[PDB]
């Protein structure tokens, strides 16, 4: 049982062939924006299903890691769910040994640590989910993104998934360092509104904020509320 | 199956290692951060990723990592691997303390990390750690010293060697081996980085001391705007 | 190299094993359509005996996970019973480990997750069967779920599974935008309008759950025969 | 080259190491099993190579738990292997739960054993179709048949082997439900002598009310009574 | 909630479509005495009913509009409430001197909750307000205030429309310091967005 | 017993923004004093001292083990350690070796690294957090260091009064003991200083 | 340790005295014995002072991982069964006689966990030594289906009856009231035990010390 | 894609006109024209099937609208109301593609 040989390896050019394919599988994923704001963040994403047939209260893409840290993805479906499982477990190891909710930076350390050995270690392919992190952690909010390589960077705004160059350029245009509450939600909504493939339905987007009282998903009556206030 | 393995731990017919010198070409794609020692302490001088505004604050950067009170390390190549190994080697440092109550003279640490990284290129069938990271440090035995290692496994005392692209030959026409006077080592560092520049797109960090205990400074913002106007010509 | 051999990333993403495993669930094809009632999650599927030499009672899809969760699967029937036995295992393991009987959603999350670790590690094929599985909890209404061989459970109203999936979900989408405990014009009529057999009560298996009686019940030719002669409107 | 490994699908979803094992029992002799109301009667074709092999040189009607049987088709090494671990499986059931093993659970258990053995490149699939069969005092004459794919179905008159294309027709035209097994022991020879189209030194075993949940090679008298169905 | 905080709660459900005159100032008894969507839709459909009869949405709208009022009414309900209510203040009015300060209270009010985009929303509708009542002097000036923020932000997101409006203000009186420059400049920034035929045909 | 092997006695008490931790400089076998200098107050942070008592191989063992895991923690996430978190970390150091435990009761004395709100804690053998705002006591001669220092400690004390009272509590506490004493040590932790001092005791 | 808990029409009322006495001397005069597990489940604790802490950090962490895995609020039956099965396989070496209670989607109910792993659904429980001092006041004046205020008064009279005639007494009573909609974890409910007062000041200033060697070290700069 | 790289070179062509396979702000105009030359009974909706914007030419707009009318010839109808529109569209309203869940 098992293989115990790495399938991720170095090209003759000198680069990882599987990781750039993982960033291709991320770049073919659903678009998701994340905006660091002066008191709190907003992590919006786009839930377009096949038909109007499914339960849009069944699966989530905003979902917390146990205290005040939500994380949203773009790319492969269930590999995300594995990273939520591992991330909740690592946050609870940290909580049972140090008796505080985990600093966001350390959670990104350990999630980027567990995503690294799937670029090695016996036949496993890398995850191909570049999920991004939020978190209030004391004083000022944080935001990160763990690539399927294992790198991570903190910033003020980003996008990912489909056509993310337009998201990074557009958020580079419209960002202010004091831009703080629901205005961030506003520009997040008009970053997903940029493509969306049509009509901007409230059941096809969900956002999550970290407004100094724990990460919480937004109820579907609140997104449609600001979709009435467009 | 034996049809599927990449077979990393195989000698070439020319005798070399295919997966090892592919890591050496991974350094030349992304890599900066020279290091200069003096009679006084040692400094790294580094480059960030690009001009992309969208970057709020790094406590330490993604380049310079603290290891003890008297050591630090900088990183080239693939940044996902080395993070792991630097936490790995950080463990090594602390357990030497647990075994000896000494602040781990840095050649012990570089030898240990190069032994485990050699162990990943020796067997196990995995890919080697694609990072030619280097180290600065001090011990009571020797002076201020920096070491430099690579994904092959060997290392050395490499008094002014840089890593990454555009390869150090100018430094081996400019470094005075006897005395260096660390302010002029900063001047030579911004010379080399000025040929290869405020702290939006540079990351320079020094190691000095006061009254015996070492001080690792990351050279906060306005010092870089001092040294960048310390030129006219160069 | 081995993009279409190993569960690894090809160029442009698109790992070429899960859609090779999706094409495995269309092999032969005995086809389930699941109907949900604001109070009754009925189950429908078609089942064809080859030669009147099989025991028709023994051939089924229609398995029972527990006293509240039933399931039906349309994949290759070799990979079916290896998947339903682990679902029974995690149901009884949930009831031994966490007290109450497992609700229907995270059962499908969990078998979706072991199907994920099939399609994450190499040296194992992602087994080709998808689990239409229904069930009722105390809080919400009846639910229905389907984890694919990639591990992407959704939370459905009315999909289908097997050969002729697209015609079935097109018929259900055209026949749900109008607004059904009896489910007489929805459940069987998806099959009889997709593939046009207008069944006698042998070849169809129906498994209901009701809010008034949450025990999973597989129906027989008497009550499904009254259910079929109720298609005379 | 999408072949040669059981962990790799076809581009239309068809694991070729299973269907190559399926023809690997289609190049081996027949073994028919006929259910009736007092039990299940097996009958296996033998393809005796030389005179050097004696009577029962290779058993192909094994038994497992003092009541279920093992009419096998394919590779006798693999069939003998899963026969003895079926013996160990009913051993763990009788030792574990006390109650004598119902056959549906044994067929599902050995079925998922040989199925879960076809999910890995580190093993080959089995190359042996085989069938079971018994009855408890309140079970009915349960028999099941298991492919190398691992699928197990309840049958009435299943037939595996080379000439199962011929053998399924006569078992279908034979009156299936209501006769009292002794005649069908006799009638089994008519199926075996029809499907053998070329020493055919056949062998029979059953479970029935003359046995009370057991197995016997015939006892030995129908071997000189069902031999008298030559010239048909 | 007191005893008379929810006493007439159903009155903003039946009288939404009972008659166009049975809730002229009658729902105002709800407004200035569950209750957050009944109260918000009471202001929205009371204000829409009085913006159907014609006048009392800004009169009794002023009677409800002093605003030492809201902080935590599910804040985007304040966005939609202030947005559509000020849309009923703008879209139709009766006394011409009113709506100048009705939207000005919304500008300095939009400074209070720090909603940046709602400011330039009501500044577009506010330069549009000053042009309709023939102010002609400082709609100019607030149009010069609006382009300073638009320039900082994505170019001409709405300052195609505001620049069109201040371009309408000059031709009432003025000359070439606008005529070709600001209009053609609005056209140069008008070929780089999703243009509806309202804005693009109005620019035509 | 086995806690009465090496003696040892530490305590800690706080008034105003200073704390005061104090040990007895003594080490040896039940009757014998093999040395006088013996480190019991181990510095971990700049202003967070842990003090240990009981069996001496356990106080050096989990003192160095705690410097290992603490030092690696503040290396993994760059900041000075919050002292409540260090209480949790010795709580999950003495525990998880519950079976055959360490024979020590470490007290933890110090300041929050950004608000300078002092506290002091104590733990048992297998590790239980006793957060305390008054004073904690560890060692063989426990109830003396209780008892008396519960009879002395008033709230809200400046460092010279706290200085004086932990001096008297230590001297008259360990004087009334056989296997402890012989010169004690007092660390005052202010918000700018560490007044480290020794005390000439009844050294007999 | 005297502990207790009573179910009533809306919910449950736990309660404990706050004193931990190692040996025959109080080590700490004010400690919480009503431990968090969940926003709808509080447990309690008696026996070993550290083992209750670690077993409810473990079941608290594992349980809220479970609850945010399910998404819904966690039930109180699974806390009972995780404490039962995890506390059983250590053969009773953990001495944690804890009770736990909860309001959930079925109904408000509480369990008791003996340190060997035996669980009891009861309307009213008492662990610790003060069980005996607080069980009789659940046998003269306990009534089923009783209103919240005299249930709070009941549990305060029970723990207060574990104060006055037990040597595992406490300083002051804290008790939590877990209802359907609101949780009320209130620290100390009544303090029937004041400190008293001192008489006469004691110290001089910069005297009464035998200083042998000072040493001063600055910190900031 | 294979025309010739010497057929342009600023002298033989000097131009290039992309034809877009149209989208949202254009698709509406195509439906408005092709329906504007038919018989409609206003049970139809316009922007509902401008919605789902998925990979159409103008030729298949003429196919689903022409097919809508011809599917209305079944009941010998001189108009089209509800199903022939939706009906033909779904039938050949791109006879689907092949999604592909997980990624996306």
UniProtKB/Swiss-Prot annotation, chain C:
One of its GO terms (molecular function) is RNA binding. Keywords: Acetylation, Cytoplasm, Glycoprotein, Nucleus, Phosphoprotein, Proteasome. The modification N6-acetyllysine is found at residues 95, 97. The keyword Membrane does not apply. SMART domains: Proteasome_A_N. Belongs to the peptidase T1A family. This is Proteasome subunit alpha type-6.
Swiss-Prot record, chain F:
It is found in: Cytoplasm; Nucleus. This is Proteasome subunit beta type-3. It comes from Homo sapiens. The gene is PSMB3. Non-catalytic component of the 20S core proteasome complex involved in the proteolytic degradation of most intracellular proteins. This complex plays numerous essential roles within the cell by associating with different regulatory particles. Associated with two 19S regulatory particles, forms the 26S proteasome and thus participates in the ATP-dependent degradation of ubiquitinated proteins. The modification N6-acetyllysine is found at residue 76. Keywords: Acetylation, Cytoplasm, Host-virus interaction, Nucleus, Proteasome. Pfam families: Proteasome (PF00227). The keyword Cytoplasm applies. The modification N-acetylserine is found at residue 1. Induction: Up-regulated in asthenozoospermic sperm. Belongs to the peptidase T1B family. GO terms for biological process: proteasome-mediated ubiquitin-dependent protein catabolic process. One of its GO terms (cellular component) is cytoplasm. InterPro entries: Ntn_hydrolases_N (IPR029055), Proteasome_beta_3 (IPR033811), Proteasome_bsu_CS (IPR016050), Proteasome_sua/b (IPR001353), Proteasome_suB-type (IPR023333).
From Swiss-Prot, chain G:
The active site is at 1 (nucleophile). Its EC number is 3.4.25.1. It is found in: Cytoplasm; Nucleus. GO terms for biological process: proteasome-mediated ubiquitin-dependent protein catabolic process. Transmembrane segments: none annotated. GO terms for cellular component: cilium; cytoplasm; cytosol; extracellular region; ficolin-1-rich granule lumen; nuclear body; nucleoplasm; nucleus. It catalyses: Cleavage of peptide bonds with very broad specificity. GO terms for molecular function: endopeptidase activity; threonine-type endopeptidase activity. The keyword Phosphoprotein does not apply. Keywords: Cytoplasm, Host-virus interaction, Hydrolase, Nucleus, Protease, Proteasome, Threonine protease, Zymogen. It comes from the Eukaryota. Expressed at a low level in colonic mucosa. Up-regulated in colorectal cancer tissues. Component of the 20S core proteasome complex involved in the proteolytic degradation of most intracellular proteins. This complex plays numerous essential roles within the cell by associating with different regulatory particles. Associated with two 19S regulatory particles, forms the 26S proteasome and thus participates in the ATP-dependent degradation of ubiquitinated proteins. Belongs to the peptidase T1B family. This is Proteasome subunit beta type-7. The lineage of its organism: Eukaryota, Metazoa, Chordata, Craniata, Vertebrata. The chain holds residues 44 to 264 of 277 of the full protein.
UniProtKB/Swiss-Prot annotation, chain H:
The chain holds residues 315 to 418 of 418 of the full protein. This is 26S proteasome regulatory subunit 6B. It is found in: Cytoplasm; Nucleus. The gene is PSMC4. Component of the 26S proteasome, a multiprotein complex involved in the ATP-dependent degradation of ubiquitinated proteins. This complex plays a key role in the maintenance of protein homeostasis by removing misfolded or damaged proteins, which could impair cellular functions, and by removing proteins whose functions are no longer required. Therefore, the proteasome participates in numerous cellular processes, including cell cycle progression, apoptosis, or DNA damage repair. Signal peptide: none annotated. Belongs to the AAA ATPase family. Disulfide bonds: none annotated. Component of the 19S proteasome regulatory particle complex. The 26S proteasome consists of a 20S core particle (CP) and two 19S regulatory subunits (RP). The regulatory particle is made of a lid composed of 9 subunits, a base containing 6 ATPases including PSMC4 and few additional components. Interacts with NR1I3. Interacts with PAAF1. Interacts with TRIM5. Interacts with ZFAND1. The modification N6-acetyllysine is found at residues 83, 87.
């Amino acid at each position: 049982r098992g293989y115990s040989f790495s399938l991720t390896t170095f090209s003759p050019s000198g680069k990882l062939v599987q990781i750039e394919y993982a960033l291709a599988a991320v770049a073919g994923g659903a678009p998701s924006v994340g905006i660091k704001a002066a008191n709190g963040v907003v992590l919006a994403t786009e839930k377009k299903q096949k038909s109007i047939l499914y339960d849009e209260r069944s699966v989530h893409k905003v979902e917390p890691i146990t205290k005040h840290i939500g994380l949203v993805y773009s790319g492969m479906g269930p590999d995300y769910r594995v990273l939520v499982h591992r991330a909740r477990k690592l946050a609870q190891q940290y909580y049972l040994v140090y008796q505080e909710p985990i600093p966001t930076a350390q959670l990104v350390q350990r999630v980027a640590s567990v995503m690294q050995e799937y670029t090695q270690s016996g036949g496993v392919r890398p995850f191909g989910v570049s999920l991004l992190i939020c978190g209030w952690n004391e004083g000022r909010p944080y935001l990160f993104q763990s690539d399927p390589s294992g790198a991570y960077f903190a910033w003020k705004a980003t996008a990912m998934g489909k056509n993310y160059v337009n998201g990074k350029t557009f958020l580079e245009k419209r960002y202010n360092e004091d831009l703080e509450l629901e205005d961030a939600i506003h520009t997040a909504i008009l970053t997903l509104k940029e493509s969306f493939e049509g009509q901007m339905t409230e059941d096809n987007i969900e956002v999550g904020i970290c407004n100094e009282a724990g990460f919480r998903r937004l109820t579907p009556t609140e997104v449609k509320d600001y979709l009435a206030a467009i | 199956s034996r049809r599927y393995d990449s077979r990393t731990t195989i000698f070439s017919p020319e005798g070399r290692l295919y997966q090892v010198e592919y890591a050496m070409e991974a350094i030349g794609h992304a890599g900066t951060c020279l290091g200069i020692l003096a009679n006084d302490g040692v400094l790294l001088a580094a480059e960030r990723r690009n001009i992309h505004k969208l970057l709020d604050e790094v406590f330490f950067s993604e380049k310079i990592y603290k290891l003890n009170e008297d050591m630090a390390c900088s990183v080239a190549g693939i940044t996902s691997d080395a993070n792991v190994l630097t936490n790995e080697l950080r463990l090594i440092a602390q357990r030497y303390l647990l075994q000896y109550q000494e602040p781990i003279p840095c050649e012990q640490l570089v030898t240990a990390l190069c032994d485990i990284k050699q162990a990943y290129t020796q067997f196990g069938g995995k890919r080697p750690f694609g990072v030619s990271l280097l180290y600065i440090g001090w011990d009571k035995h020797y002076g201020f010293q920096l070491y430099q290692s690579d994904p092959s496994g060997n290392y050395g005392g490499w008094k002014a060697t840089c890593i990454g692209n555009n390869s150090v030959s100018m430094l081996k026409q400019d470094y005075k081996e006897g005395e260096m006077t660390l302010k002029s080592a900063l001047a030579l560092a911004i010379k080399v980085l000025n040929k290869t520049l405020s702290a939006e797109k540079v990351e320079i960090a020094t190691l000095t001391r006061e009254n015996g205990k070492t001080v690792i400074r990351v050279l906060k913002q306005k010092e870089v705007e001092q040294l960048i106007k310390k030129h006219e010509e160069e | 190299g081995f993009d279409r051999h190993i569960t690894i990333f090809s160029p442009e993403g698109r790992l070429y094993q899960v859609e090779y495993a999706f094409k495995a669930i269309n092999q032969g094809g005995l086809t389930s359509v699941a109907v949900r009632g604001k109070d009754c999650a009925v189950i429908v599927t078609q089942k064809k005996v080859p030669d009147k030499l099989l025991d028709s009672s023994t051939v089924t899809h229609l398995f029972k996970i527990t006293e509240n969760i039933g399931c039906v699967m349309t994949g290759m029937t070799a990979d079916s019973r290896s998947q339903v036995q682990r679902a029974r295992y995690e149901a009884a393991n949930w009831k031994y480990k966490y007290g109450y009987e497992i609700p229907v959603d995270m059962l499908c999350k969990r078998i979706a997750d072991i199907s994920q670790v099939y399609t994450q590690n190499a040296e194992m094929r992602p087994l080709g069967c998808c689990m239409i599985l229904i069930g009722i909890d105390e809080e919400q209404g009846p639910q229905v779920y389907k984890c694919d061989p990639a591990g992407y459970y959704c939370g459905f109203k009315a999909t289908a599974a097997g050969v002729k999936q697209t015609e079935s979900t097109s018929f259900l989408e055209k026949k749900v935008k109008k607004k059904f405990e009896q489910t007489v014009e929805t459940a069987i009529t998806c099959l009889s309008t997709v593939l046009s057999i207008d069944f006698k009560p042998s070849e169809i298996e129906v498994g209901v759950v009701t809010v008034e009686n949450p025990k999973f019940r597989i129906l027989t030719e008497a009550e499904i025969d009254a259910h079929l002669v109720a298609l005379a409107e | 080259g999408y072949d040669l490994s059981a962990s790799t699908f076809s581009p239309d979803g068809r694991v070729f190491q299973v269907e190559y094992a399926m023809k690997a029992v289609e190049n081996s002799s027949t073994a028919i099993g006929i259910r009736c109301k007092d039990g299940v009667v097996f009958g296996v074709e033998k393809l005796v190579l030389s005179k050097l092999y004696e009577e029962g040189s290779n058993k192909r009607l094994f038994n497992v738990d003092r009541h279920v049987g093992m009419a096998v088709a394919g590779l006798l090494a693999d069939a003998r292997s899963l026969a003895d671990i079926a013996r160990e499986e009913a051993s763990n059931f009788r030792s574990n739960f006390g109650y004598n093993i119902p056959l549906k659970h044994l067929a599902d258990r050995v079925a998922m054993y040989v199925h879960a053995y076809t999910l890995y490149s580190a093993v080959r699939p089995f190359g042996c179709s085989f069938m079971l069969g018994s009855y408890s005092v309140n079970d009915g004459a349960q028999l099941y048949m298991i492919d190398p794919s691992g699928v197990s179905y309840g049958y009435w008159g299943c037939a595996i082997g080379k000439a199962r294309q011929a053998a399924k027709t006569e078992i279908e035209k034979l009156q299936m439900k209501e006769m009292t097994c002794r005649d069908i022991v006799k009638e089994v020879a008519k199926i075996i002598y029809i499907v053998h189209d070329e020493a055919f030194e056949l062998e029979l075993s059953w479970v029935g009310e003359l046995t009370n949940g057991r197995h016997e090679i015939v006892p030995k008298d129908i071997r000189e009574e069902a031999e008298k169905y030559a010239k048909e | 909630m007191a005893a008379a905080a929810v006493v007439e709660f159903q009155r903003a459900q039946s009288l939404l479509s009972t008659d166009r005159e049975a809730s002229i100032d009658i729902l105002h008894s709800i407004v200035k005495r569950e209750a957050v969507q009944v109260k918000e839709q009471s202001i929205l459909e009371l204000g829409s009913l009085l913006a159907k009869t014609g006048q009392a949405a800004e009169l009794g709208g002023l009677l409800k509009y002093v605003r030492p009022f809201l902080n935590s009414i599910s804040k985007a309900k304040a966005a939609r409430l202030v947005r559509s209510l000020l849309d009923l203040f703008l879209d139709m009015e009766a006394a011409t001197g009113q709506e100048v300060e009705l939207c000005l209270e919304c500008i300095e009010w939009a400074k209070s909750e720090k909603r940046t985009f709602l400011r330039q929303a009501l500044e577009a509708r506010l330069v549009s307000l000053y042009f309709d009542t023939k102010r002609y002097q400082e709609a100019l000036h607030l149009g010069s205030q609006l382009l300073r923020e638009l320039k900082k932000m994505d170019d001409k997101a709405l300052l195609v429309e505001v620049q069109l409006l201040e371009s309408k203000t000059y031709h009432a009186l003025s000359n070439l310091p606008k005529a070709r420059a600001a209009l053609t400049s609005a056209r140069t920034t008008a070929n780089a967005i999703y243009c509806p035929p309202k804005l693009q045909a109005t620019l035509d | 017993s086995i806690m009465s092997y090496n003696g040892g006695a530490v305590m800690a008490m706080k008034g105003k923004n200073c704390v005061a931790i104090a040990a007895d400089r003594r080490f040896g076998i039940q009757a014998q004093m093999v040395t006088t200098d013996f480190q019991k107050i181990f510095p971990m942070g700049d202003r967070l001292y842990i003090g240990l008592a009981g069996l001496a191989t356990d106080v050096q063992t989990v003192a160095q083990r705690l410097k290992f895991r603490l030092n690696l923690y503040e290396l993994k996430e760059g900041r000075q350690i919050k002292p409540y978190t260090l209480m949790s970390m010795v709580a999950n150091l003495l525990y998880e070796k519950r079976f055959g435990p360490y024979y020590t009761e470490p007290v933890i004395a110090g300041l929050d690294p950004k608000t300078f709100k002092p506290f002091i804690c104590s733990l048992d053998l297998i590790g239980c957090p006793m957060v305390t705002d008054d004073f904690v006591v560890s060692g063989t001669c426990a109830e003396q260091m209780y008892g008396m220092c519960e009879s002395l400690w008033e709230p809200n004390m400046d460092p010279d009064h706290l200085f004086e009272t932990i001096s008297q509590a230590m001297l008259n506490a360990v004087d009334r003991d056989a296997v402890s004493g012989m010169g004690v040590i007092v660390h005052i932790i202010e918000k700018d200083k560490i007044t480290t001092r020794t005390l000439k005791a009844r050294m007999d | 340790t005297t502990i207790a808990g009573v179910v009533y029409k809306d919910g449950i009322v736990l309660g404990a005295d706050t004193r931990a006495t190692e040996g025959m001397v109080v080590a700490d005069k004010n400690c919480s014995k009503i431990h968090f597990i969940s926003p709808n489940i509080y447990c309690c604790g008696a026996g070993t002072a550290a083992d209750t802490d670690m077993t409810t950090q473990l079941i608290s962490s594992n349980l809220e991982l479970h609850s945010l895995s399910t998404g819904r609020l966690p039930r109180v039956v699974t806390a009972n069964r995780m404490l039962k099965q995890m506390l059983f396989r250590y053969q009773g070496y953990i001495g944690a006689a804890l009770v736990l209670g909860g309001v959930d989607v079925t109904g408000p109910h509480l369990y008791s966990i003996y340190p060997h792993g035996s669980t009891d659904k009861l309307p009213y429980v008492t662990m610790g030594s003060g069980s005996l001092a607080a069980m009789a006041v659940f046998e003269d004046k306990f009534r089923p289906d009783m209103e919240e205020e005299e249930a709070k008064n009941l549990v305060s009279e029970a723990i207060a009856a574990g104060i006055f005639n037990d040597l595992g007494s406490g300083s002051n009573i804290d008790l939590c009231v877990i209802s359907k909609n609101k949780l009320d974890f209130l620290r100390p409910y009544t303090v029937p035990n004041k400190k008293g007062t001192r008489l006469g000041r004691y110290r001089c200033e910069k005297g009464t010390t035998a200083v042998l060697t000072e040493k001063i070290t600055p910190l900031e700069i | 894609d294979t025309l010739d790289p010497a057929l342009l070179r600023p002298g033989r062509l000097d131009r290039k006109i992309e034809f877009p396979l149209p989208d949202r702000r254009q698709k509406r105009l195509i439906f408005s024209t092709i329906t504007s030359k038919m018989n409609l009974s206003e049970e139809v909706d316009l922007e509902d099937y401008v919605a789902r914007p998925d990979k159409i030419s103008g030729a298949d707009i003429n196919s689903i609208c022409q097919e809508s009318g011809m599917l209305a010839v079944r009941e010998n109808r001189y108009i089209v109301l509800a199903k022939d529109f939706e009906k033909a569209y779904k039938t050949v309203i791109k006879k689907d593609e092949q999604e592909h869940e997980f990624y996306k």
